[PDB]
């Protein structure tokens, strides 16, 4: 979950490589998108949109292993400057768009890297962010130009508890090289099932494999499966995506002048041709 | 006043110069696309202009390059403009060239009296890409420091020499301060010159042979 | 109109020029005032302006600090390097890559010998040409995009 | 790293030119010549 | 971040023509 | 978009106007 990025990597959620630490636990793999505008003007509210899609009609395993639907979260870094715009600067139709959403700042004062989720998949399908652009004229040290935005969004449950031990959304391999005898199946009247399993004979050998309830099996009885061999099928239907994009804190005077200069040019070009036209004429008062 | 013209004329002979200019005629088949060359040219000079401009602020050293850029970006008067131009103008240039490579080929402009004018072109082109490449790394940021780290290996395949080549152009075994050094050299002094020689070829040859035939 | 003056098929020079592939700037509109001095500045000042505008609406970004221990994932030379890139990256014996790349410049030279057989400018009277040109061009664009895609999904461009 | 608006710009004109280029190989393949060759 | 590329292309291409005809026509409106 | 369009139109618009506008303008006071 979002907050555990926080909790295992404290200072930034994004590796030098571009990684994004989320990733680190969420080992699956699925499309993710941010849209922002192309330019925002200094000091405005604009929408910036995380898309984290999936087949809404589908469910993943839970702890015990029910088969409940699933939940999204993401982290979104906008550029130095950017913040979640003020409740009262959001105007209305946007306020509705944005929804019940818990925007949290990655660390105290990184007001521009925002955590989001868990938040439930069915309607948080995209996820809006009311964001308020900086002002290079009152923040002497915000500068105009174009800046990155890395998204890095995820849906469905993880593969590793911050503590270090496997979850159960994943597949469970094989403790041993060789031949199997018993596929047992505990259930200690609190922490649910446990299909256990054993292997043996070849190297002296007696040793065991407890495997949580969630996956299907695909294994049968007696197999000669070698160590760490696919014994479980694959529970996950969720996983992690990344995005990067570019937005442009545009000062308008630049545009304004530029526009001017575009006219000035149009206008000369006109003069030029016009001109040649007058000479296309005087020119023919000389072939006779 | 004093009659300036004549002044020159007595001495230098301004006059023939003017006639060589005014007497070159434009035929018929020469239609818009035969502006690509010139466009590519205009393109490049914009480079050269802004090129030089940034030579006054940019610092080719691995402690300094990356930041001077963002100086030029953030605190130099119109650096942002100036640097932004050098950037799109590079692109524009590589591309107007390709577009000109088209009008040559499908106008069969590159044929018997003129296979030199084409040969150069290729060279121009290899050089332009070169500017292009070297250029590209001087920011000594993440994206460009992986792209030198990438290509600079490539030649190591090539079998007697080929390392020596890489070593030549990276200035040691790994990438690093020599590389950038060498590269700034590249980019700001070698290619500016080479290009100009061969542009000069590419141009004379043309004033000499005139445009290619009609269709 | 325009303005225009015709060949001079009495000028035995123009002739022998024409003949060696070449008198072509001796007839047509004049290039002085006319082309050079009126419309050229239009092309220039035009060409300028687009870049200016291009530069100002979408100016030029700043990377992170290059780090020689972290490779970016997403890390692409510029555009007119895709084609080669594709080749280079996905052709698994290294000397072939080089070989194949140099072939671009080299080949591209040869052409006007190779294509020197007939005298024909027009891309129409040169079917076998215009074809190979077309073909090449595509394979180009294709490897092109191809470099934008991810390895495996690359050649197929994803669609087979 | 990658720059759409450029790339668009590129194909855009690559076709356009390719285009009009043959448009005039034709337009002339085909009402040819005159004044002498 | 793909809706531009597309956009670009359309205009980049299509505009040429507008300008083209714009030209052409100008030309009609004047006489030659 | 739609406003792109409009603005566009309206912009070329004008210039196109000022063109024609000025031939005649120039033309019929004998300048072309």
């Amino acid at each position: 979950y979002p907050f555990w990025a926080q909790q295992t990597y404290p200072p930034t959620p994004r590796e030098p490589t571009g990684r994004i630490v989320c990733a680190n636990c969420h080992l699956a793999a699925k499309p993710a998108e941010v849209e922002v505008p192309q330019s925002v003007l200094p000091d405005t509210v604009f929408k910036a949109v995380v898309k984290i899609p999936y087949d809404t009609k589908l469910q993943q395993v839970a702890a015990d292993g029910s088969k409940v639907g699933l939940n999204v979260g993401a982290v979104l870094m906008l550029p130095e400057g950017f913040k979640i715009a003020p409740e009262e600067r959001i105007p209305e139709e946007l306020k509705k768009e944005v929804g019940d959403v818990y925007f949290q700042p990655y660390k105290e004062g990184q007001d521009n890297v925002l955590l989001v989720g868990p938040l439930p998949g069915e309607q948080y399908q995209e996820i809006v962010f009311p964001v308020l652009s900086p002002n290079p004229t009152t923040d002497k040290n915000i500068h105009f130009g174009k800046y990155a935005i890395h998204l890095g969004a995820n849906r469905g449950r993880g593969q590793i508890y911050p503590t270090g031990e496997k979850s159960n959304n994943n597949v469970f391999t094989a403790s041993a090289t060789g031949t199997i005898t018993k596929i047992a199946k505990e259930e200690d009247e609190y922490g649910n099932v446990k299909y256990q399993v054993s292997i043996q004979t070849d190297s002296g050998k007696t040793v065991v494999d407890t495997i949580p309830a969630g996956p299907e099996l695909i294994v049968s009885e007696g197999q000669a499966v070698k160590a760490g061999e696919a014994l479980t099928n694959n529970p996950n239907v969720g996983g992690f995506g990344q995005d990067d994009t570019e937005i442009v804190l545009q000062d308008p005077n630049r545009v304004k002048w530029m526009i001017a200069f575009i006219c000035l040019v149009m206008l000369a070009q006109l003069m030029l041709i016009l001109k040649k036209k007058q000479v296309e004429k005087v020119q023919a008062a000389e072939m006779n | 006043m004093a009659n300036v013209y004549d002044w020159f004329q007595e001495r230098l002979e301004i006059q023939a110069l003017a006639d060589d200019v005014t007497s070159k005629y434009v035929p018929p088949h020469v239609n818009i696309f035969y502006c690509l060359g010139g466009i590519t040219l205009t393109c490049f000079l914009i480079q050269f202009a802004t090129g030089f401009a940034m030579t006054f602020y940019y610092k080719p050293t691995v402690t300094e390059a990356y930041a001077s850029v963002q100086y030029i970006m953030n605190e130099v008067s119109f650096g942002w403009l100036i640097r932004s131009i050098h950037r799109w103008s590079a692109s524009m240039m590589v591309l107007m060239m390709i577009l000109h490579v088209f009008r040559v080929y499908l106008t069969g402009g590159f044929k018997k009296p003129r296979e030199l004018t084409w040969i150069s072109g290729v060279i121009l082109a290899v050089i332009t890409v070169s500017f292009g490449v070297t250029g590209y790394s001087l920011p000594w940021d993440q994206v460009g420091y992986w792209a030198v780290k990438i290509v600079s290996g490539v030649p190591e395949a090539i079998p007697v020499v080929g390392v020596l080549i890489s070593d030549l152009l990276r200035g040691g075994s790994s990438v690093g301060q020599a590389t950038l050094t060498r590269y700034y050299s590249a980019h700001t002094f070698v290619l500016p010159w080479l290009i100009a020689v061969f542009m000069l070829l590419h141009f004379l040859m043309i004033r000499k042979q005139g445009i290619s035939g009609p269709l | 109109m325009a303005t225009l003056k015709k060949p001079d098929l009495s000028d035995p020079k123009l002739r022998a020029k024409l003949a060696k592939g070449m008198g072509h700037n001796y007839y047509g509109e004049p290039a002085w005032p006319n082309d050079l001095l009126y419309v050229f500045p239009v092309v220039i000042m035009g060409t300028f302006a687009c870049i200016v505008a291009l530069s100002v609406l979408d100016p030029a970004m700043v990377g992170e600090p290059a780090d020689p221990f972290a490779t970016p994932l997403e890390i692409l030379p510029e555009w007119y390097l895709y084609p080669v890139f594709q080749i280079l990256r996905s052709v698994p014996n290294k000397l072939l890559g080089v070989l194949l790349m140099a072939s671009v410049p080299l080949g591209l030279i040869l052409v006007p010998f190779i294509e020197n057989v007939n005298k024909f400018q027009n891309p129409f009277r040169r079917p076998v040409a215009t074809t190979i040109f077309l073909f090449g061009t595509l394979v180009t664009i294709w490897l092109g995009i191809g470099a934008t895609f991810p390895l495996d999904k690359t050649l197929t461009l994803g669609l087979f | 790293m990658v720059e759409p608006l450029l790339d668009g710009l590129v194909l855009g004109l690559v076709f356009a030119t390719l285009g009009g280029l043959f448009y005039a190989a034709y337009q002339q393949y085909k009402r040819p010549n005159e004044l002498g060759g | 971040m793909t809706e531009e590329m597309l956009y670009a292309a359309l205009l980049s291409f299509g505009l040429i023509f507008v300008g083209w005809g714009l030209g052409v026509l100008l030309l009609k409106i004047q006489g030659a | 978009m739609i406003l792109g369009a409009v603005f566009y139109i309206v912009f070329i618009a004008l210039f196109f106007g000022i063109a024609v506008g000025i031939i005649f303008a120039i033309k019929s006071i004998k300048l072309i």
Binding site: I262, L272 | - | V39, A53 | - | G23 | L3, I12
Partner: peptide, 29 residues
């Protein structure tokens, strides 16, 4: 928040007006 648009626009207009003017200028391709 649409001087911004005028902005791209103007890029398009010159681009056009150019070709335009270029063709008009030499009765052109």
């Amino acid at each position: 928040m649409e001087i911004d648009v005028l902005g791209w626009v103007a890029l398009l207009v010159v681009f056009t007006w150019s070709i335009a003017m270029v063709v008009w200028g030499r009765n052109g391709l």
